[PDB]
Structure 1
Amino acid sequence: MHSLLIAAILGVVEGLTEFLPVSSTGHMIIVGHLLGFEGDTAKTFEVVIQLGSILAVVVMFWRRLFGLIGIHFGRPLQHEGESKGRLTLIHILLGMIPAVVLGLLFHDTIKSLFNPINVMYALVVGGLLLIAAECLKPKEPRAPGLDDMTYRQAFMIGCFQCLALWPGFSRSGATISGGMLMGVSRYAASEFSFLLAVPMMMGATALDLYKSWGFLTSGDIPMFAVGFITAFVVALIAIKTFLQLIKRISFIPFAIYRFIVAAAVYVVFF
C-alpha cells in the first residue's frame, strides 16, 4: 500500500534528521516532493510524526525530564558533570524564552519563509554556523557535562534558537552551535538541545495541530500512526547513535552534508 509505505519512509526521514543538525524540514520537503506527498494534508502529517520523534527523547530522558518538573522516582538521578551543579527547570526556561517571544511576535512572517529557496539558504548558512562553532569553540569546555551548564549558557543557547525559526536552519544545529560557542561540550550541547526540544516541539505541534485540526479525518489515522511510531523507533536509534558518535566525531561532516542537501533542494525544486 502506497499510503503506508510513504508514511514509513517519511517516518524514517523524520526520525533520523529531527535531532541531527541536518534539518528535518529540509529533508522533508525533498522527499515529500519526490514521493508526491505535498498537500495541506502532508504538512499536517509531517507535524504529527514530529511528535513520534519527540516521544523518543521523552523515553530516552524519562527520569531527567521528570526530575526537572519536580518528580524524582525514588532513586538518585544520574550525575553528568564535573561540578556539584544540577541542570534545573530554570535552564530549560531560559533556553525557551527568546525563541518563544520571537516566534510569537513574528508568527505570520516566519510562516512566509517556508520557500525551498529559503530552506536552501538555511542549510548552507546553518552549515557555516556549525563550521564556525567548531572553529571558534574553546580548547577546554567550560561545561563538559550537562549538569555543568550555567544559566548564561542556557540563555545564550536560547537566543541561538531564534535562528531555528528560519525554515531549514535546524533547531538542533542552532542550539548545538550556540552551546559549543558558549563552552558547552558537543555531547552536553546535544543533550541540552534534545531536552529543550521537548517543551519547544510539543508546544509547536500542539499549536500546529490546533490551527490545522480541520484537515484530520478518520482515514488519516492509519497513515498518521504508521509514520508516528516509525519516527519514534528511528529517533530512538538516531539519538542513541548520535550521542555515541559525537563523542569521537566533530560536526564538520554534518556541515558538509548540509551543503549536499542544499544542492538537492536546488536540483529538485529549480
Structure 2
Amino acid sequence: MHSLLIAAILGVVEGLTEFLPVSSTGHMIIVGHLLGFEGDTAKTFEVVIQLGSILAVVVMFWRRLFGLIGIHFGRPLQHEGESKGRLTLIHILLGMIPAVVLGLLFHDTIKSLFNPINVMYALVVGGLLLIAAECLKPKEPRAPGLDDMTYRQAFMIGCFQCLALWPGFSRSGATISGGMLMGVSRYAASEFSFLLAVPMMMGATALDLYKSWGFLTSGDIPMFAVGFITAFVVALIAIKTFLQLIKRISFIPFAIYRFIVAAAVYVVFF
C-alpha cells in the first residue's frame, strides 16, 4: 500500500538520521517532498515516528537511564570511564536547562518562520561546526568515557543544544560538536547526546503532539504505527553501528555529507 510504503521509507529515514549528526528534519523535508507526503498530518506523523527513534535509545540505555532517576536493577551499572566518577541526573539536568529555557521562549517564533532555505543554511553551518569541533578539539580528551564528564561540560553541551532549535541543525550534531569542543571524546559525547535526547525529545514530542492532536483521526493509526516501529528498529541498528563506527572515523565525512544534503535541499525546493 502507498501509505504503509511511505511510512516505512520515512521510518528508515528517521531512524538513520535522528542520531547521526545529519539532521533528520533536513532529510525528512526532502523525502517527504519527493513522496508527496507534506501536509499538516505529515508533520505530525514525523513527530510520532520520532518516538520510535527515542524508544531505541531507551532500550539501548535501559539500565543507565533508570539508574539516573534512581532505579537500579540487580547487577551494578557498567562503568565507562577512567575516573571513579559516574554520570548523574545533574549532568542531564544541566544539559537540558539551556535548550528548555530558550525553547519555551522561542519555539513558536521558530516554527512560524520555517523555510527550506533555513534548513539548508543550518545543514551547512552545522557541518562547519562539526569541522571546527574536529579541528579544535584537544589532542587528549578531558572526558574519554561518559562517566568522566563534568557538570561544566554537560552544561556547555546544553548551551550548544540550543543550536538544535534551528531547524536542520541536528540536535546530535550540535551537542556532539559542543561536547568535543569541551574535551569529551567522540564516543562519550555521542552517548551523552543520545541520553540527553530522551527527555528532550520526549518533552518536545509530547508538546508538538498535544498542539497537533486535532489533526489526527482513527484512520491515521495504522500508518502512524508502521513508521513508529520502522524508526525504532532502524534507530536500533543506527545507534549501535554509529557507536561502533565513531571509534574509528571522524565527523569530517558527516560534515561533507551535510553539504551534499544542503545542495539537495536547494535543487528539490528551488
Same-fold status (TM-score > 0.5): yes
- Contact kept in structure 1, 2:107 and 2:165, CA below 8 Å: no
1:216-270 Cα offsets, whole Å, 9 max, x none, are 1111000000000000000000000000000000000000000000000000000
Partner of 1:120: 120
Which stretch of the first structure deviates more once superposed, 247-256 or 105-114?
Answer: 105-114
Partner of 1:207: 207
The within-5 A match list for 1:88-107 is 88-107=88-107
- Runs of 4+ in structure 1 deviating by more than 4 angstroms, as ranges, are none
Q: CA deviation at 1:97?
A: 0.1
- Contact kept in structure 2, 1:23 and 1:168, CA below 8 Å: yes
> Aligned partners of 2:186, 2:212: CA distance in 1, in Å?
36
1:30-65 Cα offsets, whole Å, 9 max, x none, are 000000000000000000000000000000000000
- Contact kept in structure 1, 2:127 and 2:256, CA below 8 Å: yes
1:160-199 Cα offsets, whole Å, 9 max, x none, are 0000000000000000000000000000000000000000
TM-score by length of 2: 1.00
> Aligned partners of 1:136, 1:149: CA distance in 2, in Å?
19
> Aligned partners of 1:14, 1:167: CA distance in 2, in Å?
15
Q: SS in structure 2 opposite 1:162?
A: helix
- Contact kept in structure 2, 1:134 and 1:252, CA below 8 Å: yes
- Contact kept in structure 2, 1:120 and 1:266, CA below 8 Å: yes
Q: CA deviation at 1:67?
A: 0.2
> Aligned partners of 1:114, 1:27: CA distance in 2, in Å?
15
Q: SS in structure 2 opposite 1:4?
A: helix
Partner of 2:46: 46
Which stretch of the first structure deviates more once superposed, 102-111 or 7-16?
Answer: 102-111
> Aligned partners of 1:5, 1:107: CA distance in 2, in Å?
32
- Contact kept in structure 1, 2:41 and 2:215, CA below 8 Å: yes
> Aligned partners of 1:86, 1:112: CA distance in 2, in Å?
41
Contiguous gaps of at least 5 residues in structure 2 = none
Partner of 1:134: 134
> Aligned partners of 2:218, 2:238: CA distance in 1, in Å?
31
> Aligned partners of 1:79, 1:179: CA distance in 2, in Å?
19
- Contact kept in structure 2, 1:103 and 1:110, CA below 8 Å: no
- Contact kept in structure 1, 2:103 and 2:165, CA below 8 Å: yes
> Aligned partners of 2:15, 2:108: CA distance in 1, in Å?
27
- Contact kept in structure 2, 1:123 and 1:259, CA below 8 Å: yes
TM-score by length of 1: 1.00
Q: CA deviation at 1:113?
A: 3.4
Q: CA deviation at 1:109?
A: 1.2
Q: CA deviation at 1:112?
A: 2.6
Partner of 2:266: 266
Contiguous gaps of at least 5 residues in structure 1 = none
Q: CA deviation at 1:158?
A: 0.1
- Contact kept in structure 2, 1:113 and 1:167, CA below 8 Å: no
Q: CA deviation at 1:75?
A: 1.2
> Aligned partners of 1:99, 1:212: CA distance in 2, in Å?
22
- Contact kept in structure 1, 2:7 and 2:224, CA below 8 Å: yes
Q: CA deviation at 1:74?
A: 1.5
> Aligned partners of 2:108, 2:211: CA distance in 1, in Å?
13
- Contact kept in structure 2, 1:92 and 1:154, CA below 8 Å: yes
